[PDB]
């Protein structure tokens, strides 16, 4: 009745597997590792159906548990069994961590073979499994007092910068996002704020980083006391599951050694209801360039001899669209050598969403002495995604 069970780490590598019915191949494993673990804009739901296959997933700390089926299984069965088995594992070796899985592979295999037979969750009381299992688990100052304001207000700003280096064929060579959250709070008294956020943040070569303020308390949730005025709450750098707003496709044709043709097509890979503004595309041209004739149906294009590049300016663009610029370049044959080494095409833009996928879930403000609560406070939230070094090789 249960097709099979899988246990994944946070990075997306399968820690362990156990398949009980042959109607589920490694394609299902790849589909779970792609569509659910590495989802970008997929709506979260415990039960997901893809390719006529149902996956029920439960997250414990940074460990994923997935039950895979292809039939019309009792939905509550799967989740109750998952909770019971997690409780059994916790009873056997305490907290559930990747190291504990690595140490007790054998006990995990024994338990999965024992409590689950062909998908049928037989009687699996934790007390009664002692007889059937012969193995033993291996266990292992910043805010002044007396603040008053006429009205309560706060602003949150999630400011992010995306950096991308892309190959001409579309392979993502590198990409990373550097972000910070800025809180500007006019609150009266000594408030206590609980900040709750989703799982897109885990707690030269870009590597994942997360650094909080001095007032942050961890125990999920982040509890703090906002200092008056504006302050930086947390800063971070992320590298996985980045959302790239734009895609640039260059096509360069070298007609002999005298002429050149450059056609650049840009595509907007975000929702149709969002709008990117102040877009600028910098297209390099060879040093020995006599002149260029450029035509484009969106924005305006101009040639800069001092900088030796074509600047294409678009005031704004919506999502899921396309645009094209075509330039014909005439070259004077000074030297028939020193081939034009093509530098990457540069992009600058501004998007009203966080490219890293971050989204603030809730912010509860409680005051013990005074009477106001989060209902009284007025809250603004703004997301500002921007381009850092956004380069596509041409």
């Amino acid at each position: 009745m249960i097709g099979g069970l899988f246990i994944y780490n946070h990075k997306g590598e399968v820690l362990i597997s156990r398949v009980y019915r042959d109607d589920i191949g490694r394609n299902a494993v790849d589909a779970f590792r792609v569509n659910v673990i590495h989802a970008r804009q997929q709506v979260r739901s415990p039960v997901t159906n893809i390719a006529r296959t149902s996956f029920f997933h439960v997250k414990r700390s940074n460990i994923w548990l997935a039950a895979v089926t292809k039939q019309n299984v009792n939905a509550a069965m799967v989740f109750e069994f998952l909770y019971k088995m997690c409780d059994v594992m916790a009873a056997y070796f305490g907290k559930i961590s990747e190291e504990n899985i690595k140490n007790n592979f054998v006990l995990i295999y024994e338990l999965l073979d024992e409590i689950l037979d062909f998908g049928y969750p037989q009687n699996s009381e934790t007390g009664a499994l002692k007889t059937f299992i012969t193995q033993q688990g291996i266990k292992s100052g910043w805010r002044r007092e007396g603040i008053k304001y006429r009205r309560n207000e706060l602003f949150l700003d999630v400011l992010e910068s995306v950096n991308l280096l892309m190959s001409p064929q579309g392979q993502v060579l590198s990409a990373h996002v550097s972000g910070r959250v800025v809180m500007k709070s006019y609150l009266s008294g000594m408030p206590e704020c609980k900040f709750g956020m989703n799982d897109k943040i885990v707690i030269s070569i870009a590597i994942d980083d997360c650094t909080f303020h001095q007032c942050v308390r961890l125990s999920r949730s982040i509890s703090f006391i906002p200092p008056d005025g504006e302050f930086e709450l947390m800063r971070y750098r992320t590298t996985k599951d980045i959302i790239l707003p734009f895609r640039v496709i260059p096509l360069v044709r070298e007609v002999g050694r005298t002429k050149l043709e450059v056609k650049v097509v840009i595509k907007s890979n975000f929702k149709p209801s969002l709008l990117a503004q102040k877009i600028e595309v910098r297209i390099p041209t060879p040093l020995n360039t006599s002149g260029v004739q450029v035509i484009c149906m969106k924005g305006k294009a101009k040639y800069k001899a001092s900088e030796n590049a074509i600047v294409w300016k678009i005031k704004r663009m919506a999502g899921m669209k396309e645009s094209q610029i075509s330039a014909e370049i005439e070259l004077l044959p000074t030297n028939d050598k020193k081939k034009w080494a093509r530098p990457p095409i540069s992009m600058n833009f501004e998007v009203p969403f966080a490219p890293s996928g971050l989204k603030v879930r809730y912010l509860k403000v409680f005051e013990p002495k005074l009477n106001y609560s989060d209902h009284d406070v007025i809250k603004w939230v703004r997301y500002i995604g921007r381009s850092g070094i956004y380069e596509t090789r041409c």
């Binding site: 006529r52 054998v106 037989q122 209801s273 007025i378 809250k379």
Partner: protein, 579 residues
């Protein structure tokens, strides 16, 4: 070539040597290392025979870890494990029947066409054993054998044995065979599931109070397929099923609810039992929502259908479905949908007191959906439209961007539902005109300006402000701008001749869109043809709209109610959709 492949001073030779030792103390560690290496993807086929030689031992652990590797290799390389059945067959006569059960399970885990000769014979001899666990494992592997495509002439004998196994004094065993029969009946021939109603039902209802946690689930799932025939029998079955409020969070409770709601047919008010049962069905559903978030999500998906089929059960229990701040989003959305489902004319004053609250929080998705729910309330209850419009005006006045855009989009629908009732609101909307960035909000604003053109004297300037950046805009805003300007012309002629000419020139010539050009010509060929017929054609009365969005197909609803517990009720799709 064979570079780095040598096995003279490598770890493979050391592992092979270590498996040939007669000391179990090092043998257990060697087997654990082999298992770990196989888990990491290493090729240990060359070490397979030695592990086979490890199976000839008396110690319990060594055999258990060996069978674990055999099970690992069964799915990986079935062919290699196929030939090892000659040692598995000679293991059903020893004491300690748990070893026999393990061997039977492992042998059934192999999928080989010729394995039946080594599989059919032992099974017929294992159902008659002192230990009921052997019979339990046999009942489990019967389904696995049935999975293999074969004639199975002895299927009649297998079904007879399974049916005879039900009438057994000893509890999880029978509530494993009932599940096996339920699985077999999933591929039901023309003559299947013999209805031995009296004895089988009496035994099932007698063992129901003594089965394990999953035993009740299996028995209830099997019983839900049955169709009663007597009103007194139906009353007895319902009375026997109601005490299912067990410690199992949902599965037992949800299955009991499914059985009771499917077994719901009797006189309306001839006996005071229908009311009692409807009253009893509320506390379990209400207490379902206190579990883990996933189980909450399943319970809410089922409660949606329960409310759809019969709203009398949860009529006054809307206080439970309010949103907590720390809940996951997929539970918040379902709670909102159920809240809108139960909104009667009595509790709006409190429901609307919560939805407005939800529009003052940080989560943007929930804020947009809460404003949309405020809109849906005013179309379901005709006595609260003024209150809903007041709430929407307040949410517009709070000056937040994503609140304002959704509020305007919703007020458009409310206006379309109740024409010529909120003309005075228009001015208050206009001041909040510069913060419209979505195309839906701009389209709604332009449509509202187009309507009630006589009630606004400033509409001409408002549309002249729009015409300047006619391009670089979505197609829907251009279309609604055309329609609004043409409607404005037909109400205020002799003063807007510049507007219509400008907009028709922009749509006809500058825009290359095919259908937009078609509409530009269609409008142009009416205004210049005759202004009498054009006014009747464009400004004709538009029929009203009912709230058909919040409805389901009755046949689909009945099928889903028949399948409350399963995944059919979670996706709200027919079972044949996914196979």
């Amino acid at each position: 070539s064979k570079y780095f492949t040598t096995n003279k001073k490598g770890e493979i030779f050391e592992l092979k040597a270590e498996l040939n030792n007669e000391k179990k103390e090092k043998r257990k560690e060697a087997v654990k290392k082999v298992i770990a290496a196989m888990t990491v993807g290493k090729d240990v086929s060359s070490l397979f025979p030695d592990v086979v030689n490890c199976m000839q031992t008396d110690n319990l652990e060594l055999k258990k870890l060996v069978y674990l590797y055999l099970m690992n290799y069964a799915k990986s390389q079935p062919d290699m494990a196929i030939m090892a059945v000659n040692s598995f067959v000679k293991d059903c006569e020893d004491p300690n029947p748990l070893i026999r059960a393990l061997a039977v399970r492992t042998m059934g885990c192999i999928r080989v066409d010729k394995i039946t000769e080594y599989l059919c014979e032992p099974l017929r001899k294992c159902l008659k054993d002192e230990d009921p666990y052997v019979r339990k494992t046999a009942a489990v592997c019967v389904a696995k054998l049935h999975d293999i495509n074969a004639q199975m002439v002895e299927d009649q004998g297998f079904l007879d044995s399974l049916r005879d196994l039900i009438a057994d004094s000893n509890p999880m065993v029978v509530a494993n065979a009932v599940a096996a029969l339920s699985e077999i009946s999933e591929s039901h021939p023309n003559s299947n599931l013999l209805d031995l109603n009296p004895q089988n039902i009496n035994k099932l209802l007698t063992a129901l109070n003594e089965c394990t946690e999953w035993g009740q689930i299996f028995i209830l799932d099997c019983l839900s397929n049955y169709n009663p025939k007597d009103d007194r029998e139906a009353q007895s079955i319902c009375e026997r099923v109601t005490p299912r409020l067990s410690h199992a969070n949902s599965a037992v409770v949800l299955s009991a609810v499914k059985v009771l709601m499917k077994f719901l047919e009797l006189l309306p008010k001839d006996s005071d039992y229908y009311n009692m049962l409807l009253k009893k069905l509320a506390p379990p559903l209400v207490t379902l929502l206190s579990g883990e978030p996933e189980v909450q999500y399943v319970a809410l998906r089922n409660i949606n259908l329960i409310v759809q089929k019969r709203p009398e059960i949860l009529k006054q229990e809307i206080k439970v479905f309010f949103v907590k701040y720390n809940d996951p989003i997929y539970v918040k959305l379902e709670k909102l949908d159920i809240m809108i489902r139960l909104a009667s004319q009595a509790n709006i004053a409190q429901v609307l007191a919560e939805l407005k609250e939800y529009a003052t929080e940080v989560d943007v998705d929930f804020v947009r959906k809460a404003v949309r729910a405020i809109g849906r309330c005013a179309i379901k209850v005709e006595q609260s439209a003024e209150r809903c419009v007041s709430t929407l005006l307040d949410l517009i006045q709070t000056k937040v961007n994503y609140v304002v855009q959704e509020a305007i989009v919703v007020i458009r629908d409310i206006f379309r539902k109740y024409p010529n009732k909120y003309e005075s609101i228009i001015a208050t909307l206009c001041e909040n005109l510069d913060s419209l960035d979505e195309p839906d909000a701009r389209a709604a604003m332009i449509w509202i300006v187009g309507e009630y053109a006589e009630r606004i004297d400033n509409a001409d300037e408002l549309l002249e402000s729009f015409l300047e950046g006619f391009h670089d805009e979505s197609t829907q805003v251009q279309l609604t701008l055309l329609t609004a300007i043409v409607k404005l012309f037909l109400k205020k002629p002799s003063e807007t001749q510049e507007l219509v000419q400008q907009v028709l020139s922009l749509a006809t010539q500058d825009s290359d869109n095919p259908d937009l050009r078609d509409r530009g010509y269609i409008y142009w060929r009416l205004l210049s043809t005759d202004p009498v017929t054009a006014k009747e054609v464009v400004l004709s009365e538009k029929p009203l709209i009912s709230e058909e969005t919040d409805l389901i197909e009755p046949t689909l609803l009945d099928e889903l109610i028949c399948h409350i517990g399963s995944l059919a009720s979670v996706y709200h799709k027919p079972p044949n959709a996914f196979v």
